[PDB]
Amino acid sequence: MENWSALELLPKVGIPTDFLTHVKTSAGEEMFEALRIYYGDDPERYNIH
Amino acid sequence: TVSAPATYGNFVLSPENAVTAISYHSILADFNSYKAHLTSGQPHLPNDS
Amino acid sequence: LDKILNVEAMHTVLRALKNTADAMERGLIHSFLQTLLRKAPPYFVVQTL
Amino acid sequence: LDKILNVEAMHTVLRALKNTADAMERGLIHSFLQTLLRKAPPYFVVQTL
Amino acid sequence: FEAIFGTFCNRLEWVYFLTSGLAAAAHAIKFHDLNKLTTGKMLFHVQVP
Numbered sequence: 001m002e003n004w005s006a007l008e009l010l011p012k013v014g015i016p017t018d019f020l021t022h023v024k025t026s027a028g029e030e031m032f033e034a035l036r037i038y039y040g041d042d043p044e045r046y047n048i049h
Numbered sequence: 050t051v052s053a054p055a056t057y058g059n060f061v062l063s064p065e066n067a068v069t070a071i072s073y074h075s076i077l078a079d080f081n082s083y084k085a086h087l088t089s090g091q092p093h094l095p096n097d098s
Numbered sequence: 099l100d101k102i103l104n105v106e107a108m109h110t111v112l113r114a115l116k117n118t119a120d121a122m123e124r125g126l127i128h129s130f131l132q133t134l135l136r137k138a139p140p141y142f143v144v145q146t147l
Numbered sequence: 148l149d150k151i152l153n154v155e156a157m158h159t160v161l162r163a164l165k166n167t168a169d170a171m172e173r174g175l176i177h178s179f180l181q182t183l184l185r186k187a188p189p190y191f192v193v194q195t196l
Numbered sequence: 197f198e199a200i201f202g203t204f205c206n207r208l209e210w211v212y213f214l215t216s217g218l219a220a221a222a223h224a225i226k227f228h229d230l231n232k233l234t235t236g237k238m239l240f241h242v243q244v245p
Contacts, residue, residue, distance in 0.1 A: 007239045009106055020196045023242055032240075041110070046103055070197035077200045090154040097202035113243065120245060165208065175213045179222060 004036045005045050060098065 019026060027035050066076045077083070078098040086094060213219055 002237075002239070007241060009102070012241055017242065020193075023244060027242075041114075046107075048099065074197040075200055076197050078202045087151055087154075090150075092158060093205070094202065097204070117243060117245065124245075169208065169211065172211055172213050176211075176216060176218060180218060183221065 002034050002036075005047070008042070008045050 017023075021029075024037075026032075027037060060078075062076065063079070063081055066080050069080060070076050082094060082098070086092070213224070
């Protein structure tokens with residue numbers, strides 16, 4: 001299930017991201033393989049083991 | 050004003066070829082030419098007869 | 099290790115504001131456009147008068 | 148006479164390599180275009196989006 | 197005699213991947229240790245306006 005806790009702590013790169021059909025419409029049709037949407041803030045990321 | 054050729058071409062036999070017709074009856078064109086390239090090792094001929 | 103969490107939590111705050119501050123301006127674009135729709139009678143009414 | 152077979156065999160390798168070295172470039176042309184066809188939905192699908 | 201005029205052979209064309217316009221669709225890279233790797237990936241992050 002990948003390592004989603006890492007991705008929001010690891011530094012990234014801002015890129016333009018134009019594409020068709022909204023963004024929830026694209027990710028919500030599982031066009032991407034792995035995904036992890038959540039509608040609030042995520043408590044789960046600060047833990048490390 | 051087309052620059053057409055003004056004279057018919059010609060193809061006189063090389064004297065060394067005359068022995069080859071006496072042999073197995075075959076005047077390969079420019080027998081002197083092939084002899085040089087085989088010694089130099091060069092593949093392609095600069096221009097066929 | 100722990101100091102990254104003090105920094106990463108602060109970026110989580112600033113990104114919440116940059117989304118909200120953008121969200122505020124778009125609402126003024128939205129509700130004002132919603133107002134003009136209620137003051138915009140259909141053209142066959144406007145032309146008849 | 149013996150040298151001729153050496154000069155011929157040395158050019159047999161140069162042709163055996165460049166026939167394949169030229170083929171290696173075309174295969175990257177072919178396998179890459181083969182991939183795009185797997186990422187090329189028919190136009191009416193993209194047009195609906 | 198049965199004369200045989202000079203033989204002919206075609207010249208090879210020199211195709212290249214970078215010279216082709218299909219290369220514009222690719223960002224070609226060399227990587228000598230490619231055989232060892234199993235899978236690659238690129239994680240993405242999108243917060244919705």
